[PDB]
Amino acid sequence: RMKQLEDKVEELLSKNYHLENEVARLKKLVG
Amino acid sequence: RMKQLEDKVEELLSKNYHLENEVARLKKLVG
């Protein structure tokens, strides 16, 4: 169902943005 | 539509794993 799939997309995007935030913070640590 | 949404989840999923790996590599290295 469409709804469940839409939601899964929204959720994955949201986890992805969280992980990209971490990478940038860790990047800042590196240099 | 259904099949494009499935594909997007698959794509986000793949991306998420790559970011996790990346986050794991940078942490090790950094802290």
Side-chain angles (χ1 to χ4, degrees), chain A residues 2-6 8-13 15 18-20 22-31:
Chain A
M2 228 154 33
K3 209 176 346 153
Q4 271 285 75
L5 285 157
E6 285 173 356
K8 191 88 183 129
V9 172
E10 300 172 350
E11 162 186 25
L12 287 163
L13 181 69
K15 296 201 235 197
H18 173 251
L19 293 161
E20 282 164 42
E22 285 290 285
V23 168
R25 162 213 143 221
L26 300 137
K27 277 200 175 176
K28 180 213 127 191
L29 284 219
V30 172

Side-chain angles (χ1 to χ4, degrees), chain A residues 9 16 20 23 27 29-30, chain B residues 5 12 15-16 22-23 30:
Chain A
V9 172
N16 292 0
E20 282 164 42
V23 168
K27 277 200 175 176
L29 284 219
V30 172
Chain B
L5 290 169
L12 286 174
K15 191 164 162 143
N16 185 259
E22 186 179 353
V23 155
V30 153

Side-chain angles (χ1 to χ4, degrees), chain B residues 11-22:
Chain B
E11 285 163 7
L12 286 174
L13 189 57
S14 180
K15 191 164 162 143
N16 185 259
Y17 285 157
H18 163 247
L19 289 172
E20 298 265 26
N21 312 355
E22 186 179 353

